Amino acid sequence: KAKAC
Amino acid sequence: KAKAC
Amino acid sequence: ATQGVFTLPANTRFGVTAFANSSGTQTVNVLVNNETAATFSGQSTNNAVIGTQVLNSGSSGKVQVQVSVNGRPSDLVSAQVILTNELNFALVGSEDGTDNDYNDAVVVINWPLG
Amino acid sequence: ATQGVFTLPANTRFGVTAFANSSGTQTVNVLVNNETAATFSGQSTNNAVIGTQVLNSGSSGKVQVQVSVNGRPSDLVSAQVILTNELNFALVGSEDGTDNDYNDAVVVINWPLG
Amino acid sequence: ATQGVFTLPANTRFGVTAFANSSGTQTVNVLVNNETAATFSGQSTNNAVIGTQVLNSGSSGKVQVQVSVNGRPSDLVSAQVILTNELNFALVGSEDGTDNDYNDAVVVINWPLG
Amino acid sequence: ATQGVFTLPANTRFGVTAFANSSGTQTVNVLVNNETAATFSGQSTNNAVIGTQVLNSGSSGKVQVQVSVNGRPSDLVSAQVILTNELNFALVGSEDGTDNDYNDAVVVINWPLG
Ligand SMILES: *C(=O)C[C@@H]1O[C@@H](C)[C@@H](O)[C@@H](O)[C@@H]1O
Ligand SMILES: *C(=O)C[C@@H]1O[C@@H](C)[C@@H](O)[C@@H](O)[C@@H]1O
Ligand SMILES: *C(=O)C[C@@H]1O[C@@H](C)[C@@H](O)[C@@H](O)[C@@H]1O
Ligand SMILES: *C(=O)C[C@@H]1O[C@@H](C)[C@@H](O)[C@@H](O)[C@@H]1O
Ligand SMILES: [Ca+2]
Ligand SMILES: [Ca+2]
Ligand SMILES: [Ca+2]
Ligand SMILES: [Ca+2]
Ligand SMILES: [Ca+2]
Ligand SMILES: [Ca+2]
Ligand SMILES: [Ca+2]
Ligand SMILES: [Ca+2]
């Protein structure tokens, strides 16, 4: 989910 | 040929 | 061990298709004879096809799949499978984070075609 | 032996994608718990994606792939492959004629998704 | 589809090993270039190795596994798997009866050796 | 990615068999539910069976294969393959040196038995 940023 | 010898 | 590298029969057409299952944008590069032959880019958490293309294995037959997310190489797992000694699948999974589902970019190479 | 039948974990999202490599129009039926859940139809000799979809394996987890050409069932070859004990591929090839390249319809099922 | 037939690289040394899981005596024939290169015979319900041998794939590279019980050919399933584009497994399962566990004779071909 | 770890059905008997292709003495450890169930030690450069055994997958069905040579863990490659939705092969290769043939210890797990 942190890949989104 | 080095793994043992 | 090296992953994502496959020796195909030389000068053979093959399909390459990439699926995305991650919050991160997947950059899938396909090299033939160490030379970029196709590049896919896409994001999806529902297995969207981010690219599908017909390529030729070229005189060497060497095909390599590379996956990166935000400029960072993903960890790859791969294998080749042959059914009835004729139908070939070269399979790649990739992990861009830490949950280790290895589906973030899924690449399927299949041959022969036609 | 039976081919094209796979047991998935119950209630699991899985992708299913079909490719065509034949002069004959390919009809791919995907059954979940013995009921038709998806149908793909298309013709191609260049590995075109005639269909791709996300389904759910339901309470039984039974997934079956059927291929027919002009109403004639095709002969199927299949196998399931698991990478790093996590990434699953259920693979299907089919032959509608006499050359036995078994690529006439190629179906790839993959899970987990997301 | 044909099963138990594999095209190896030519002039390549490979291992073949058979396991038995049946009350019937299993007869496994290993053909290289359509000529019998090895024959295993044994009975076991506990996965005992009934035969193992090193063979050469010859000029054609064609290897075929046949299984029969009391002259009755078993139903074969097979596939080839390649890991890190180097390590090859050619796998055969066989069913000699009615319960469809397809383990009655299990044959593993692996290469390279040495 | 983790290699050599497989989830089997619980309380299921499986076979494990190791072949050697290396000048180095191979030590194969088979762990069931994180505890050693079998250990093989042998040396061969021609695919000799250094061990074979029937084990029970136990309560959780976790099976892990470890390979070491002179105390050094080898690099593992692995995959699992299922034929006709019933016959299971869990495959392991290992490299103890620099030639990357990944056959130095080859381990094949198969189930069901009987
Ligand atoms: C978070 O960005 C990590 C990432 O995206 C998730 C939605 C999930 O697909 C996870 O497997 C992936 O590594
Ligand atoms: C030498 O010790 C390395 C070793 O043994 C060789 C005979 C060959 O099998 C090689 O692959 C292995 O790593
Ligand atoms: C023709 O009807 C047979 C058919 O189509 C060919 C172009 C080729 O793909 C063949 O494999 C297929 O069975
Ligand atoms: C009996 O001959 C059938 C036979 O042997 C059983 C012990 C069991 O292994 C079964 O799978 C096999 O077909
Ligand atoms: Ca992930
Ligand atoms: Ca994911
Ligand atoms: Ca055909
Ligand atoms: Ca075709
Ligand atoms: Ca049987
Ligand atoms: Ca049996
Ligand atoms: Ca080695
Ligand atoms: Ca070796």
Coordinates of C-alpha atoms and ligand atoms in Angstrom, one line a residue:
Chain A
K1 CA 0.0 0.0 0.0
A2 CA 2.9 2.4 0.7
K3 CA 3.9 1.9 -3.0
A4 CA 1.0 4.2 -3.8
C5 CA 3.1 7.2 -2.6
Chain B
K1 CA 35.6 -29.5 -7.5
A2 CA 36.7 -27.5 -4.5
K3 CA 33.9 -28.5 -2.2
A4 CA 36.3 -31.1 -0.9
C5 CA 39.9 -31.5 -2.2
Chain C
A1 CA 19.4 -18.2 -8.3
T2 CA 18.7 -16.2 -11.4
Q3 CA 15.0 -15.8 -12.1
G4 CA 13.1 -14.4 -15.1
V5 CA 15.4 -15.7 -17.8
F6 CA 14.3 -18.3 -20.3
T7 CA 15.9 -19.9 -23.3
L8 CA 13.3 -20.3 -26.0
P9 CA 13.8 -22.0 -29.3
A10 CA 15.5 -19.6 -31.7
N11 CA 13.5 -17.4 -34.1
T12 CA 10.1 -18.4 -32.6
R13 CA 7.2 -16.2 -32.0
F14 CA 5.9 -16.0 -28.5
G15 CA 3.3 -14.1 -26.5
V16 CA 4.1 -12.1 -23.4
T17 CA 1.3 -10.8 -21.1
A18 CA 1.6 -8.9 -17.8
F19 CA -1.0 -8.6 -15.0
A20 CA -0.8 -6.1 -12.1
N21 CA -2.0 -6.7 -8.5
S22 CA -0.5 -3.9 -6.4
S23 CA -0.9 -0.3 -5.4
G24 CA 2.5 0.3 -7.1
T25 CA 2.9 1.1 -10.8
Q26 CA 4.5 -2.0 -12.4
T27 CA 7.2 -1.4 -15.0
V28 CA 7.7 -4.7 -16.9
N29 CA 10.7 -4.9 -19.4
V30 CA 11.1 -7.8 -21.8
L31 CA 14.6 -8.3 -23.2
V32 CA 15.4 -10.5 -26.2
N33 CA 19.0 -11.2 -26.7
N34 CA 19.8 -8.7 -23.9
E35 CA 18.0 -6.0 -25.9
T36 CA 14.8 -4.3 -24.8
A37 CA 11.9 -5.7 -26.9
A38 CA 8.9 -4.5 -25.0
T39 CA 8.1 -2.4 -22.0
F40 CA 4.7 -2.4 -20.1
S41 CA 3.6 0.1 -17.5
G42 CA 0.4 -0.1 -15.4
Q43 CA -1.2 -0.3 -12.0
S44 CA -4.1 -2.5 -10.8
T45 CA -5.3 -4.5 -7.8
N46 CA -7.7 -6.6 -9.9
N47 CA -5.4 -8.4 -12.2
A48 CA -5.7 -5.9 -15.1
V49 CA -3.8 -6.8 -18.2
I50 CA -1.2 -4.0 -18.4
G51 CA 0.4 -5.3 -21.6
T52 CA 0.2 -8.1 -24.1
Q53 CA 2.4 -8.4 -27.2
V54 CA 3.7 -10.9 -29.7
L55 CA 7.5 -11.0 -29.9
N56 CA 10.2 -13.1 -31.7
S57 CA 12.7 -15.0 -29.6
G58 CA 15.4 -14.0 -32.1
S59 CA 18.6 -15.8 -33.1
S60 CA 19.6 -16.4 -29.5
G61 CA 16.2 -17.4 -28.0
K62 CA 17.2 -15.7 -24.7
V63 CA 14.2 -13.9 -23.1
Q64 CA 14.5 -12.0 -19.8
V65 CA 11.7 -10.4 -17.8
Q66 CA 12.6 -7.5 -15.4
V67 CA 10.1 -5.8 -13.0
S68 CA 10.6 -2.6 -11.1
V69 CA 8.4 -0.4 -9.0
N70 CA 9.3 3.3 -8.5
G71 CA 12.8 2.5 -9.9
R72 CA 13.4 -0.4 -7.5
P73 CA 13.8 -3.9 -8.9
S74 CA 11.2 -6.4 -7.6
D75 CA 12.1 -9.9 -6.3
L76 CA 11.3 -12.4 -9.1
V77 CA 10.2 -16.0 -9.0
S78 CA 10.0 -18.0 -12.2
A79 CA 9.6 -21.4 -13.8
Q80 CA 9.0 -23.0 -17.2
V81 CA 6.4 -25.7 -17.8
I82 CA 5.7 -27.8 -20.9
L83 CA 2.5 -29.7 -21.5
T84 CA 2.3 -32.7 -23.9
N85 CA 5.9 -31.9 -25.0
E86 CA 4.5 -29.1 -27.2
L87 CA 2.9 -26.2 -25.2
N88 CA 5.3 -24.0 -23.3
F89 CA 4.6 -21.6 -20.4
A90 CA 7.3 -19.4 -18.9
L91 CA 6.0 -17.9 -15.7
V92 CA 7.1 -15.0 -13.6
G93 CA 5.9 -13.6 -10.3
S94 CA 7.3 -10.5 -8.6
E95 CA 7.2 -9.0 -5.1
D96 CA 7.5 -5.2 -4.8
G97 CA 7.0 -5.0 -1.0
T98 CA 6.9 -7.2 2.1
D99 CA 3.6 -9.2 2.0
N100 CA 5.2 -11.8 -0.3
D101 CA 2.2 -12.6 -2.4
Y102 CA 4.5 -12.3 -5.5
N103 CA 1.5 -11.3 -7.7
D104 CA 2.3 -7.6 -7.9
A105 CA 3.3 -8.1 -11.5
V106 CA 2.6 -11.5 -13.1
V107 CA 4.1 -12.2 -16.5
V108 CA 3.1 -15.1 -18.7
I109 CA 5.1 -16.1 -21.8
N110 CA 3.5 -18.7 -24.0
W111 CA 4.6 -20.4 -27.2
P112 CA 4.3 -21.7 -29.9
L113 CA 1.7 -19.4 -31.6
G114 CA -0.4 -19.7 -34.7
Chain D
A1 CA -7.2 -38.5 -17.2
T2 CA -9.5 -35.5 -16.6
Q3 CA -8.0 -32.2 -17.7
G4 CA -9.0 -28.6 -17.1
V5 CA -10.4 -29.2 -13.6
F6 CA -8.8 -27.4 -10.7
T7 CA -9.6 -27.2 -7.0
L8 CA -9.1 -23.6 -5.7
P9 CA -9.5 -22.5 -2.1
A10 CA -13.1 -21.6 -1.4
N11 CA -14.4 -18.1 -2.1
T12 CA -11.1 -16.9 -3.7
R13 CA -10.8 -14.3 -6.4
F14 CA -8.9 -15.6 -9.4
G15 CA -8.1 -14.3 -12.8
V16 CA -8.9 -16.2 -16.0
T17 CA -7.5 -15.3 -19.4
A18 CA -7.7 -17.0 -22.8
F19 CA -5.6 -16.7 -25.9
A20 CA -6.4 -17.9 -29.4
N21 CA -4.1 -19.5 -32.0
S22 CA -6.2 -21.1 -34.7
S23 CA -8.2 -20.4 -37.8
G24 CA -11.3 -21.7 -35.9
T25 CA -13.3 -19.5 -33.5
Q26 CA -12.6 -20.6 -30.0
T27 CA -15.3 -20.9 -27.3
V28 CA -14.0 -21.0 -23.8
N29 CA -16.4 -21.7 -20.9
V30 CA -15.4 -21.3 -17.3
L31 CA -17.5 -23.3 -14.8
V32 CA -17.6 -22.6 -11.1
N33 CA -19.3 -25.3 -8.9
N34 CA -20.5 -26.8 -12.2
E35 CA -22.2 -23.6 -13.4
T36 CA -21.1 -21.4 -16.3
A37 CA -19.5 -18.3 -14.8
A38 CA -17.7 -16.8 -17.9
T39 CA -17.7 -17.4 -21.6
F40 CA -15.1 -16.2 -24.0
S41 CA -15.3 -16.2 -27.8
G42 CA -12.9 -15.1 -30.4
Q43 CA -10.7 -16.0 -33.4
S44 CA -7.0 -15.3 -33.8
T45 CA -3.8 -16.8 -35.2
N46 CA -1.6 -14.3 -33.3
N47 CA -2.4 -15.1 -29.6
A48 CA -4.9 -12.3 -29.2
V49 CA -6.6 -12.2 -25.8
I50 CA -10.2 -13.3 -26.6
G51 CA -11.2 -12.8 -22.9
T52 CA -10.0 -11.9 -19.4
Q53 CA -12.0 -11.7 -16.3
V54 CA -12.0 -11.9 -12.5
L55 CA -14.2 -14.6 -11.0
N56 CA -14.8 -16.1 -7.5
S57 CA -14.2 -19.8 -6.8
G58 CA -17.3 -20.0 -4.7
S59 CA -18.1 -22.3 -1.8
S60 CA -16.8 -25.4 -3.6
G61 CA -13.6 -24.1 -5.1
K62 CA -14.2 -26.2 -8.1
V63 CA -13.1 -24.5 -11.3
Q64 CA -13.4 -26.2 -14.7
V65 CA -12.3 -24.9 -18.2
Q66 CA -14.0 -26.2 -21.3
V67 CA -13.1 -25.4 -24.9
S68 CA -15.1 -26.0 -28.0
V69 CA -14.8 -25.0 -31.7
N70 CA -18.0 -24.8 -33.7
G71 CA -19.7 -26.9 -31.1
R72 CA -17.0 -29.6 -31.0
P73 CA -15.2 -30.1 -27.6
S74 CA -11.4 -29.7 -27.9
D75 CA -8.9 -32.0 -26.4
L76 CA -7.4 -30.4 -23.3
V77 CA -4.0 -30.6 -21.5
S78 CA -3.6 -28.9 -18.1
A79 CA -1.5 -28.6 -15.0
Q80 CA -1.2 -26.4 -11.9
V81 CA 2.1 -24.8 -10.8
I82 CA 2.9 -23.1 -7.5
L83 CA 5.8 -20.7 -7.1
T84 CA 7.4 -19.9 -3.6
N85 CA 4.4 -21.8 -2.1
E86 CA 2.2 -18.8 -2.8
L87 CA 1.7 -17.9 -6.4
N88 CA -0.7 -20.3 -8.3
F89 CA -1.1 -20.9 -12.0
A90 CA -3.7 -23.2 -13.5
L91 CA -2.7 -23.8 -17.1
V92 CA -4.8 -25.2 -20.0
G93 CA -4.0 -25.9 -23.6
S94 CA -6.4 -27.2 -26.2
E95 CA -6.3 -28.8 -29.7
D96 CA -9.1 -28.4 -32.2
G97 CA -7.5 -30.1 -35.2
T98 CA -4.8 -32.6 -36.2
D99 CA -1.5 -30.7 -35.9
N100 CA -1.3 -31.1 -32.1
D101 CA 0.2 -27.8 -31.2
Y102 CA -2.4 -27.5 -28.4
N103 CA -2.3 -23.7 -28.5
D104 CA -5.6 -23.2 -30.3
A105 CA -7.1 -21.9 -27.1
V106 CA -4.7 -21.2 -24.2
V107 CA -6.2 -20.4 -20.8
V108 CA -4.3 -19.1 -17.8
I109 CA -5.8 -19.0 -14.4
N110 CA -3.9 -17.2 -11.6
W111 CA -4.3 -16.4 -7.9
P112 CA -4.2 -14.9 -5.4
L113 CA -5.2 -11.4 -6.7
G114 CA -4.9 -8.0 -5.2
Chain E
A1 CA -3.0 -35.7 -25.7
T2 CA 0.1 -37.9 -25.8
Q3 CA 1.8 -38.3 -22.3
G4 CA 5.1 -39.5 -21.1
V5 CA 7.0 -38.3 -24.2
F6 CA 9.8 -35.7 -23.7
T7 CA 12.4 -34.1 -26.0
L8 CA 15.6 -33.7 -24.1
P9 CA 18.7 -32.0 -25.4
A10 CA 20.6 -34.4 -27.6
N11 CA 23.5 -36.4 -26.3
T12 CA 22.6 -35.5 -22.7
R13 CA 23.0 -37.8 -19.7
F14 CA 19.9 -38.0 -17.5
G15 CA 18.6 -39.9 -14.6
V16 CA 15.3 -41.9 -14.5
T17 CA 13.7 -43.3 -11.3
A18 CA 10.5 -45.1 -10.7
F19 CA 8.4 -45.4 -7.6
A20 CA 5.6 -47.8 -6.9
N21 CA 2.4 -47.2 -4.9
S22 CA 0.1 -50.1 -5.9
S23 CA -0.7 -53.8 -5.2
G24 CA 0.0 -54.4 -8.9
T25 CA 3.5 -55.2 -10.2
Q26 CA 4.5 -52.2 -12.2
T27 CA 6.5 -52.5 -15.5
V28 CA 8.1 -49.3 -16.6
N29 CA 9.8 -49.1 -20.0
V30 CA 12.1 -46.1 -20.9
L31 CA 12.5 -45.7 -24.6
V32 CA 15.3 -43.6 -26.2
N33 CA 14.8 -42.8 -29.9
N34 CA 11.9 -45.4 -29.9
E35 CA 14.2 -48.2 -28.6
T36 CA 14.0 -49.6 -25.1
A37 CA 16.9 -48.2 -23.0
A38 CA 15.8 -49.4 -19.5
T39 CA 13.1 -51.5 -18.0
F40 CA 12.0 -51.4 -14.3
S41 CA 9.8 -54.0 -12.6
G42 CA 8.7 -54.0 -9.0
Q43 CA 5.8 -53.9 -6.5
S44 CA 5.3 -51.6 -3.6
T45 CA 2.5 -49.7 -1.8
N46 CA 5.0 -47.6 0.1
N47 CA 6.7 -45.6 -2.7
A48 CA 9.7 -47.9 -2.9
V49 CA 12.2 -47.2 -5.6
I50 CA 11.7 -50.1 -8.1
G51 CA 14.4 -48.8 -10.4
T52 CA 16.9 -46.0 -11.0
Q53 CA 19.4 -45.6 -13.9
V54 CA 21.5 -43.1 -15.8
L55 CA 20.9 -43.0 -19.6
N56 CA 22.0 -40.9 -22.6
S57 CA 19.4 -39.0 -24.6
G58 CA 21.2 -39.9 -27.9
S59 CA 21.1 -38.0 -31.1
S60 CA 17.3 -37.5 -31.2
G61 CA 16.8 -36.6 -27.6
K62 CA 13.4 -38.3 -27.6
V63 CA 12.6 -40.1 -24.3
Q64 CA 9.3 -41.9 -23.8
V65 CA 8.1 -43.6 -20.6
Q66 CA 5.6 -46.4 -20.7
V67 CA 3.9 -48.1 -17.8
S68 CA 1.8 -51.3 -17.8
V69 CA 0.5 -53.9 -15.3
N70 CA -0.1 -57.5 -16.5
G71 CA 0.2 -56.2 -20.1
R72 CA -2.4 -53.5 -19.5
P73 CA -1.0 -50.0 -20.2
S74 CA -1.7 -47.5 -17.4
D75 CA -3.2 -44.1 -18.0
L76 CA -0.3 -41.5 -17.9
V77 CA -0.1 -37.9 -16.9
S78 CA 3.0 -35.9 -17.4
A79 CA 4.7 -32.5 -17.6
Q80 CA 8.2 -31.0 -17.8
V81 CA 9.4 -28.3 -15.4
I82 CA 12.5 -26.2 -15.7
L83 CA 13.9 -24.3 -12.7
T84 CA 16.3 -21.3 -13.1
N85 CA 16.5 -22.1 -16.8
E86 CA 18.8 -25.0 -16.1
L87 CA 17.4 -27.8 -13.9
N88 CA 14.9 -30.0 -15.7
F89 CA 12.3 -32.4 -14.3
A90 CA 10.2 -34.6 -16.6
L91 CA 7.4 -36.1 -14.5
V92 CA 5.1 -39.1 -15.1
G93 CA 2.1 -40.3 -13.0
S94 CA 0.2 -43.4 -13.9
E95 CA -3.1 -45.1 -12.9
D96 CA -3.4 -48.8 -13.2
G97 CA -6.8 -49.3 -11.6
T98 CA -10.0 -47.4 -10.7
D99 CA -9.2 -45.0 -7.8
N100 CA -7.5 -42.4 -10.0
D101 CA -4.7 -41.6 -7.5
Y102 CA -2.3 -41.8 -10.5
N103 CA 0.6 -42.7 -8.2
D104 CA 0.7 -46.4 -9.0
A105 CA 4.0 -45.9 -10.9
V106 CA 5.6 -42.5 -10.5
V107 CA 8.6 -41.8 -12.8
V108 CA 11.0 -38.9 -12.4
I109 CA 13.5 -37.9 -15.1
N110 CA 16.0 -35.3 -14.2
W111 CA 19.0 -33.6 -15.8
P112 CA 21.6 -32.3 -16.1
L113 CA 23.7 -34.8 -14.0
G114 CA 27.3 -34.5 -12.7
Chain F
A1 CA 12.0 -15.5 -2.4
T2 CA 11.8 -18.4 0.0
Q3 CA 12.5 -21.7 -1.7
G4 CA 12.1 -25.3 -0.6
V5 CA 9.0 -24.7 1.6
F6 CA 5.7 -26.4 0.8
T7 CA 2.3 -26.7 2.3
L8 CA 0.9 -30.2 2.1
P9 CA -2.5 -31.4 3.3
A10 CA -2.4 -32.3 7.0
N11 CA -1.8 -35.8 8.2
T12 CA -0.8 -37.0 4.7
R13 CA 2.0 -39.4 3.9
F14 CA 4.5 -38.2 1.3
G15 CA 7.7 -39.6 -0.2
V16 CA 11.0 -37.6 -0.2
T17 CA 14.0 -38.7 -2.3
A18 CA 17.4 -37.0 -2.8
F19 CA 19.8 -37.4 -5.6
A20 CA 23.4 -36.2 -5.6
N21 CA 25.5 -34.7 -8.5
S22 CA 28.5 -33.0 -6.8
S23 CA 32.0 -33.7 -5.5
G24 CA 30.7 -32.3 -2.2
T25 CA 28.9 -34.4 0.4
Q26 CA 25.3 -33.4 0.4
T27 CA 23.4 -33.2 3.7
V28 CA 19.6 -33.0 3.1
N29 CA 17.4 -32.1 6.0
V30 CA 13.6 -32.6 5.7
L31 CA 11.7 -30.6 8.3
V32 CA 8.0 -31.2 9.1
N33 CA 6.3 -28.5 11.1
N34 CA 9.7 -26.9 11.7
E35 CA 11.3 -30.0 13.1
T36 CA 13.6 -32.5 11.4
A37 CA 11.8 -35.6 10.2
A38 CA 14.5 -37.1 8.0
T39 CA 18.2 -36.5 7.2
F40 CA 20.2 -37.8 4.2
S41 CA 23.9 -37.6 3.8
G42 CA 25.6 -38.9 0.7
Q43 CA 28.0 -38.1 -2.2
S44 CA 27.8 -38.8 -5.9
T45 CA 28.5 -37.2 -9.2
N46 CA 26.1 -39.5 -11.1
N47 CA 22.7 -39.0 -9.6
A48 CA 22.9 -41.7 -6.9
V49 CA 19.9 -41.9 -4.5
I50 CA 21.4 -40.8 -1.2
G51 CA 18.1 -41.2 0.6
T52 CA 14.4 -41.9 0.3
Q53 CA 11.7 -42.1 2.9
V54 CA 8.0 -41.9 3.6
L55 CA 7.0 -39.2 6.1
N56 CA 3.8 -37.8 7.5
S57 CA 3.0 -34.2 6.9
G58 CA 1.5 -33.9 10.4
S59 CA -0.7 -31.3 12.0
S60 CA -0.1 -28.2 9.8
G61 CA 1.4 -29.8 6.7
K62 CA 4.4 -27.5 6.5
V63 CA 7.4 -29.3 4.8
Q64 CA 10.8 -27.7 4.3
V65 CA 13.9 -28.9 2.6
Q66 CA 17.3 -27.7 3.6
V67 CA 20.6 -28.6 1.9
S68 CA 24.1 -27.9 3.1
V69 CA 27.7 -28.9 2.1
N70 CA 30.4 -28.8 4.7
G71 CA 28.1 -26.8 6.9
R72 CA 27.4 -24.1 4.2
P73 CA 23.7 -23.8 3.1
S74 CA 23.3 -24.3 -0.6
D75 CA 21.2 -22.0 -2.8
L76 CA 17.8 -23.5 -3.4
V77 CA 15.3 -23.4 -6.3
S78 CA 11.9 -25.0 -6.0
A79 CA 8.4 -25.3 -7.3
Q80 CA 5.3 -27.5 -6.9
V81 CA 3.3 -29.1 -9.7
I82 CA -0.1 -30.8 -9.7
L83 CA -1.3 -33.2 -12.4
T84 CA -4.9 -34.1 -13.1
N85 CA -5.8 -32.1 -10.0
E86 CA -4.6 -35.0 -7.7
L87 CA -0.9 -36.0 -8.2
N88 CA 1.6 -33.7 -6.5
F89 CA 5.3 -33.1 -7.0
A90 CA 7.3 -30.7 -4.9
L91 CA 10.7 -30.2 -6.5
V92 CA 14.0 -28.8 -5.1
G93 CA 17.3 -28.1 -6.7
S94 CA 20.4 -26.8 -5.0
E95 CA 23.8 -25.2 -5.9
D96 CA 26.8 -25.6 -3.6
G97 CA 29.4 -24.0 -5.8
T98 CA 29.9 -21.6 -8.8
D99 CA 28.8 -23.6 -11.9
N100 CA 25.1 -23.0 -11.3
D101 CA 23.9 -26.3 -12.5
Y102 CA 21.7 -26.6 -9.3
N103 CA 21.7 -30.4 -9.4
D104 CA 24.2 -30.8 -6.6
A105 CA 21.4 -32.2 -4.4
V106 CA 18.0 -32.8 -6.1
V107 CA 15.1 -33.5 -3.9
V108 CA 11.7 -34.8 -5.1
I109 CA 8.6 -34.9 -2.9
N110 CA 5.6 -36.8 -4.1
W111 CA 2.1 -37.4 -2.8
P112 CA -0.4 -39.1 -2.3
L113 CA 1.1 -42.5 -1.6
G114 CA -0.4 -46.0 -1.3
Ligands
LIG1 C1 1.6 -1.6 -0.9 O1 1.6 -0.8 -1.8 C2 2.2 -3.0 -1.3 C3 1.5 -3.6 -2.4 O2 0.1 -3.2 -2.8 C4 -0.9 -4.0 -2.1 C5 -2.3 -3.5 -2.6 C6 -0.7 -5.5 -2.3 O3 -1.0 -5.8 -3.7 C7 0.7 -5.9 -2.0 O4 0.9 -7.3 -2.4 C8 1.7 -5.1 -2.8 O5 3.0 -5.5 -2.5
LIG2 C1 33.2 -28.9 -6.8 O1 33.3 -29.2 -5.7 C2 31.8 -28.3 -7.2 C3 30.8 -29.3 -7.5 O2 31.1 -30.6 -7.8 C4 31.2 -30.7 -9.3 C5 31.7 -32.2 -9.6 C6 30.0 -30.3 -10.0 O3 28.9 -31.2 -9.7 C7 29.5 -29.0 -9.5 O4 28.2 -28.7 -10.1 C8 29.4 -28.9 -8.0 O5 28.9 -27.6 -7.7
LIG3 C1 -7.5 -25.3 -39.1 O1 -8.6 -25.3 -38.9 C2 -6.7 -25.9 -37.9 C3 -6.2 -24.9 -36.9 O2 -5.9 -23.6 -37.2 C4 -4.5 -23.5 -37.7 C5 -4.2 -22.1 -38.3 C6 -3.5 -23.9 -36.7 O3 -3.5 -23.0 -35.6 C7 -3.9 -25.2 -36.1 O4 -3.2 -25.4 -34.9 C8 -5.4 -25.2 -35.6 O5 -5.7 -26.6 -35.1
LIG4 C1 -5.5 -52.8 -6.9 O1 -4.8 -53.6 -7.6 C2 -5.4 -51.4 -7.3 C3 -4.2 -50.6 -6.8 O2 -3.5 -50.9 -5.6 C4 -4.0 -50.2 -4.5 C5 -3.2 -50.7 -3.2 C6 -3.9 -48.7 -4.6 O3 -2.6 -48.3 -4.7 C7 -4.6 -48.4 -6.0 O4 -4.3 -47.0 -6.2 C8 -4.0 -49.1 -7.1 O5 -4.6 -48.7 -8.3
CA5 CA 3.2 -7.9 -2.8
CA6 CA 0.0 -7.9 -4.6
CA7 CA -4.0 -27.1 -33.4
CA8 CA -2.8 -23.6 -33.4
CA9 CA -4.4 -46.2 -8.6
CA10 CA -2.0 -46.3 -5.8
CA11 CA 26.8 -27.1 -8.8
CA12 CA 26.6 -30.6 -10.0

